[PDB]
Amino acid sequence: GRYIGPVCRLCRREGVKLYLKGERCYSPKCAMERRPYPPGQHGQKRARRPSDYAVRLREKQKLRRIYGISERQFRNLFEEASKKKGVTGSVFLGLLESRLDNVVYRLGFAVSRRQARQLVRHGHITVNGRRVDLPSYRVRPGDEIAVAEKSRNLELIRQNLEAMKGRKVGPWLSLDVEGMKGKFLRLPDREDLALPVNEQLVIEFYSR
Amino acid sequence: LTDPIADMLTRIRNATRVYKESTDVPASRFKEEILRILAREGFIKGYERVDVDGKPYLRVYLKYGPRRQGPDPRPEQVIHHIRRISKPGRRVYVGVKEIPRVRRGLGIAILSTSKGVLTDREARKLGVGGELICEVW
Amino acid sequence: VKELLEAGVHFGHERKRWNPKFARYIYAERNGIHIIDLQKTMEELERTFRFIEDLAMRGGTILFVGTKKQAQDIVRMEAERAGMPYVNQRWLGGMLTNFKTISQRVHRLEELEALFASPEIEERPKKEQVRLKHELERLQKYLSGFRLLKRLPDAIFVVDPTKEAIAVREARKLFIPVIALADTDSDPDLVDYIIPGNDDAIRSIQLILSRAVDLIIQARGGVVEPSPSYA
Amino acid sequence: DFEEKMILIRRTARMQAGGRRFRFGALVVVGDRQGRVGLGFGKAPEVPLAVQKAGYYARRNMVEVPLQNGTIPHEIEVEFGASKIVLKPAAPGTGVIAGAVPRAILELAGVTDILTKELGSRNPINIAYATMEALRQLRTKADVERLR
RNA sequence: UAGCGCCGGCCAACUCCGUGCCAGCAGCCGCGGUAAUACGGAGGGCGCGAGCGUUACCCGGAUUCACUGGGCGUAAAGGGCGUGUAGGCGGCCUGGGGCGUCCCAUGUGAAAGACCACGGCUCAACCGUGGGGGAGCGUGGGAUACGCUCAGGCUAGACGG
RNA sequence: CUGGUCCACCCGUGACGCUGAGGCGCGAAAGCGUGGGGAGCAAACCGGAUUAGAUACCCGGGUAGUCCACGCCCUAAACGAUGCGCGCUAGGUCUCUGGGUCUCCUGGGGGCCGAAGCUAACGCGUUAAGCGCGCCGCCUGGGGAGUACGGCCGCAAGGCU
Ligand code: SF4
Ligand SMILES: [Mg+2]
Ligand SMILES: [Mg+2]
Ligand SMILES: [Mg+2]
Ligand SMILES: [Mg+2]
Ligand SMILES: [Mg+2]
Ligand SMILES: [Mg+2]
Ligand SMILES: [Mg+2]
Ligand SMILES: [Mg+2]
Ligand SMILES: [Mg+2]
Ligand SMILES: [Mg+2]
Ligand SMILES: [Mg+2]
Ligand SMILES: [Mg+2]
Ligand SMILES: [Mg+2]
Ligand SMILES: [Mg+2]
Ligand SMILES: [Mg+2]
Ligand SMILES: [Mg+2]
Ligand SMILES: [Mg+2]
Ligand SMILES: [Mg+2]
Ligand SMILES: [Mg+2]
Ligand SMILES: [Mg+2]
Ligand SMILES: [Mg+2]
Ligand SMILES: [Mg+2]
Numbered sequence A: 001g002r003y004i005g006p007v008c009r010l011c012r013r014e015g016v017k018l019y020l021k022g023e024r025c026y027s028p029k030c031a032m033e034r035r036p037y038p039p040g041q042h043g044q045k046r047a048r049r050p051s052d053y054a055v056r057l058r059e060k061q062k063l064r065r066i067y068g069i070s071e072r073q074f075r076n077l078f079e080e081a082s083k084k085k086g087v088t089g090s091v092f093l094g095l096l097e098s099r100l101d102n103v104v105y106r107l108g109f110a111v112s113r114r115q116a117r118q119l120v121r122h123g124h125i126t127v128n129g130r131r132v133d134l135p136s137y138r139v140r141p142g143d144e145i146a147v148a149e150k151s152r153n154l155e156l157i158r159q160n161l162e163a164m165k166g167r168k169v170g171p172w173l174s175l176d177v178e179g180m181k182g183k184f185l186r187l188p189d190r191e192d193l194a195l196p197v198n199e200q201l202v203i204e205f206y207s208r
Numbered sequence B: 001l002t003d004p005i006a007d008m009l010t011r012i013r014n015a016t017r018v019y020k021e022s023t024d025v026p027a028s029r030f031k032e033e034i035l036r037i038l039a040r041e042g043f044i045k046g047y048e049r050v051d052v053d054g055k056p057y058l059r060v061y062l063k064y065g066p067r068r069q070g071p072d073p074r075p076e077q078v079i080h081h082i083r084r085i086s087k088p089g090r091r092v093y094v095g096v097k098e099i100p101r102v103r104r105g106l107g108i109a110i111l112s113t114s115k116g117v118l119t120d121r122e123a124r125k126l127g128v129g130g131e132l133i134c135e136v137w
Numbered sequence C: 001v002k003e004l005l006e007a008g009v010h011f012g013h014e015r016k017r018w019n020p021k022f023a024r025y026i027y028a029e030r031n032g033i034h035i036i037d038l039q040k041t042m043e044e045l046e047r048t049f050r051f052i053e054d055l056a057m058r059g060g061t062i063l064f065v066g067t068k069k070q071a072q073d074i075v076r077m078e079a080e081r082a083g084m085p086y087v088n089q090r091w092l093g094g095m096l097t098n099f100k101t102i103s104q105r106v107h108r109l110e111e112l113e114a115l116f117a118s119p120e121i122e123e124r125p126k127k128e129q130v131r132l133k134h135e136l137e138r139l140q141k142y143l144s145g146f147r148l149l150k151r152l153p154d155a156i157f158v159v160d161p162t163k164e165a166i167a168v169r170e171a172r173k174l175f176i177p178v179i180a181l182a183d184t185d186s187d188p189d190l191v192d193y194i195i196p197g198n199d200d201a202i203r204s205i206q207l208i209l210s211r212a213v214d215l216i217i218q219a220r221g222g223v224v225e226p227s228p229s230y231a
Numbered sequence D: 001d002f003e004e005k006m007i008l009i010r011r012t013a014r015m016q017a018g019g020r021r022f023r024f025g026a027l028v029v030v031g032d033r034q035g036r037v038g039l040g041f042g043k044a045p046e047v048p049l050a051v052q053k054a055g056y057y058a059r060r061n062m063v064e065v066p067l068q069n070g071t072i073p074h075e076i077e078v079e080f081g082a083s084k085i086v087l088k089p090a091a092p093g094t095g096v097i098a099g100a101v102p103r104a105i106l107e108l109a110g111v112t113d114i115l116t117k118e119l120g121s122r123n124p125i126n127i128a129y130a131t132m133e134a135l136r137q138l139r140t141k142a143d144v145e146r147l148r
Numbered sequence E: 001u002a003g004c005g006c007c008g009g010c011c012a013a014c015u016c017c018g019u020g021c022c023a024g025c026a027g028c029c030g031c032g033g034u035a036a037u038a039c040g041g042a043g044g045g046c047g048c049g050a051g052c053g054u055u056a057c058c059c060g061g062a063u064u065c066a067c068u069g070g071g072c073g074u075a076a077a078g079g080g081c082g083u084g085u086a087g088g089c090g091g092c093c094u095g096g097g098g099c100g101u102c103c104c105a106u107g108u109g110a111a112a113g114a115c116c117a118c119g120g121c122u123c124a125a126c127c128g129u130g131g132g133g134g135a136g137c138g139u140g141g142g143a144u145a146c147g148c149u150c151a152g153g154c155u156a157g158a159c160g161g
Numbered sequence F: 001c002u003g004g005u006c007c008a009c010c011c012g013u014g015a016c017g018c019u020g021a022g023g024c025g026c027g028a029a030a031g032c033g034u035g036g037g038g039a040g041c042a043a044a045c046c047g048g049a050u051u052a053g054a055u056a057c058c059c060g061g062g063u064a065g066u067c068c069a070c071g072c073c074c075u076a077a078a079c080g081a082u083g084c085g086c087g088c089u090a091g092g093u094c095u096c097u098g099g100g101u102c103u104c105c106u107g108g109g110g111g112c113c114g115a116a117g118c119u120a121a122c123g124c125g126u127u128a129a130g131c132g133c134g135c136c137g138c139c140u141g142g143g144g145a146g147u148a149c150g151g152c153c154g155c156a157a158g159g160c161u
């Protein structure tokens, strides 16, 4: 399946902060906050000139690892968007964010997509009323996403819920809080999320 | 001689490199009809039907770019390029849909047609095609 | 001031050692030697000078370039009239393309001017006198009136461009307008402002060079009439 | 100031009795990403010397690239002795698609969208030189209609 | 349940022992002869992920059979030289025909699939619905620049006095 | 006895043209057959020397062959390692042969340096290797190999493919 292994090693090797769990990634107990150098026996050694390839290799994994998606699942969409109209970048981006799990986390239902998926994969979520244990469902504009009424009685949801009431949600997002029923408004533009990514670099990558 | 057209074109391309105020060619209504295009688009200055020791000609009056500094001050060419397309060795024929657009729109291709010589654009406007005479810029 | 009577001073020469690019500036060659169409000769004069004065009334510099034994001497005249840089002897390569380092060879000269200006130890072993003094007379031979050029010229002037294609080359690269006189043999095109006339008849050399300077002073502050002139 | 990029560096060699004394070459470009770029070639008895020397040239041999939207105006095709370079107009979503040498050269020129291809002696040196004057030969509707 | 490939360059990923042109890896250039980032093991790391690798074969890179789109002085390639059949090709001007050639209309060009839109299995893969074209050739009409054909002139190629 | 070729006059025919897979003919030397011829020279051969050896380089002899006639043989560094025709693109100096008006101008060949341009460089450059059009031959890593097989040619050695 997805990754599911040691994760901090991601942020480190990348040299950037990926808030892959939730709270700690903000805490001063973080790795990059403590050890922002490569994992393994050779982290603190002077890095050397990465290759033009190696570079383009990064941005990918960085993004790819950000959502924890199989390489394949990350070819399709970018074969999707690339064969999709207009600027392949924005589309693929919107194609990625359009995943349930993500949006679920983007809707502050869980600190990590990792949680998002599980709650998603555990069907605790719903959409337009319908229940969806499908962490790969490409949610489209006009979709009503509702927590499982059967799981509205859970406390974790509310602890993440509570820490959301008036929290700032994406322009292409709402969050009728309490009702545990958000909503997915539109497809974003690059300027809608300033990810630590240079998407074109990933374009250059599969251009091989 | 095989193809006067390329020869015509060739004569031009041969002088433009040496920067001739003009040059000559044996005459033919077709060669002229061509040349007709080649000033209305602005690559030449125009032609006049001259006449050499008894024989007709077409002294073409040549247009070039401005003097320049650097070490190579020689004036850039108007007709950067001019090469034959359809030939006696390989006659080349196009339908209106398959009519190329020279150098993204900066050049043209002279076309012989049932409705007179045209440019890559004039044909598409008139909705026809024909024997691609040449492409030039 | 262009006169016109010049016809009795140079009116061209040089055999079939000509240059094909020069024919538009020739009417014939009745004496087995090309003939310069003094008409267009004016037309360039009427065009070239229009460039000269302009630089003058603008404050730019002009560098004179003439190394023939013919024009060996006239150079130091009309130049020093105009009081501007000049290159009488050898044309030191890179004299423009490599200015920053050429020029740095004049401080050595000016410096020797300081020292040899006197004391600061004449207690230097006699071997060191004569030798520098010699090292000075050389530095002086070549640099005398290019020591004047403390920055890159806004243009230059040339007697024999084919002779000074070296000179001609470095400017053409540096975008320094190049004006000069030439006869048959030289390559026009290579010139920026042209005085197609004889390049060995001092008599004709002085004519141009002299009058050229006149439009310097005539635009460079004041006026004067006669100048030197060996018969 | 501008932005510098090192396409290549190589150690040459000269034969003298008692050994083969060396010398390094530096391929260095430089661009603002707004119409201007430069490519000199550096040589110096040691690595960083040549790089810096090159940059001095790289900024003494410039050219003005009439970009449009991130691509170029017209598809250019130039041979440098043996190396032949192909430059084609691309659209926004595209993204530069060229070898390192051209890419490195084209990228600092600001181009976001271009189709390319090296042919023949794709020696990075010559492929570069030809790459430049390919740009040194790009033109505009204005430049066109100007001459006409 | 976590397994596999890889870590000298290409090509992302490093050190330690054993060994000592031996036992070995190898797709190419090449690794090893007592300080191996190149074998083996281990630590660690890189990439995918119920997959991972290898072999085989096809296209790609191969612009290396080159119509797009290559080339023959010395790198492989001008026939030893001529004459001449078939064939390919063919200078200026006028007219007829309308073969190539071009335009429009029109019938066929089944459906499946490919491509865009959307709809059902909780997604996707899969499948359904509608939409949107062509080349190619059959039928009718038209235009005549270039190619061709039939006819009439000319003299700038050739032949001749 | 005969061919090709050039210049002038600009008299005649009026595109009659270029190229040319096949085919055909020519094809230096050596070599073959038949019949002559045979001074000089000269493969093999003998001898004398140099060498460690010297079936060679140098020397003394010397047979075919080199010469003529008629037949074959058809290869080569048969080279400009550059196919043929035409048109376009600065010139300078030398030389062959023509025509003029005789300073010089113009045609056709033979060399040289060089405009731009080409070219991987050395180099070419109105005798292109430059910009072009037509047609033929030809190349597709090295060796194996111009070998094997088959077919054709040949008296044979051997040639072509
Ligand atoms: S945010 Fe911090 S704690 Fe979280 S995965 Fe990244 S480095 Fe580790
Ligand atoms: Mg796209
Ligand atoms: Mg691809
Ligand atoms: Mg074609
Ligand atoms: Mg002179
Ligand atoms: Mg250089
Ligand atoms: Mg190659
Ligand atoms: Mg290579
Ligand atoms: Mg411009
Ligand atoms: Mg692997
Ligand atoms: Mg390995
Ligand atoms: Mg190593
Ligand atoms: Mg890989
Ligand atoms: Mg590496
Ligand atoms: Mg292994
Ligand atoms: Mg090797
Ligand atoms: Mg060891
Ligand atoms: Mg799977
Ligand atoms: Mg293959
Ligand atoms: Mg590729
Ligand atoms: Mg291809
Ligand atoms: Mg090739
Ligand atoms: Mg060879």
Ligand SMILES: [Mg+2]
Pocket: none
């Ligand atoms: Mg030959």
Ligand SMILES: [Mg+2]
Pocket: none
């Ligand atoms: Mg025939």
Ligand SMILES: [Mg+2]
Pocket: none
């Ligand atoms: Mg015809």
Ligand SMILES: [Mg+2]
Pocket: none
């Ligand atoms: Mg007709």
Ligand SMILES: [Mg+2]
Pocket: E098, E099
């Ligand atoms: Mg027809």
Ligand SMILES: [Mg+2]
Pocket: none
């Ligand atoms: Mg169908």
Ligand SMILES: [Mg+2]
Pocket: none
């Ligand atoms: Mg659906």
Ligand SMILES: [Mg+2]
Pocket: none
């Ligand atoms: Mg369908």
Ligand SMILES: [Mg+2]
Pocket: none
């Ligand atoms: Mg289609």
Ligand SMILES: [Mg+2]
Pocket: none
């Ligand atoms: Mg159809």
Ligand SMILES: [Mg+2]
Pocket: none
């Ligand atoms: Mg029809």
Ligand SMILES: [Mg+2]
Pocket: none
């Ligand atoms: Mg007709």
Ligand SMILES: [Mg+2]
Pocket: none
């Ligand atoms: Mg025919």
Ligand SMILES: [Mg+2]
Pocket: none
């Ligand atoms: Mg007729």
Ligand SMILES: [Mg+2]
Pocket: none
């Ligand atoms: Mg004639």
Ligand SMILES: [Mg+2]
Pocket: none
């Ligand atoms: Mg004749």
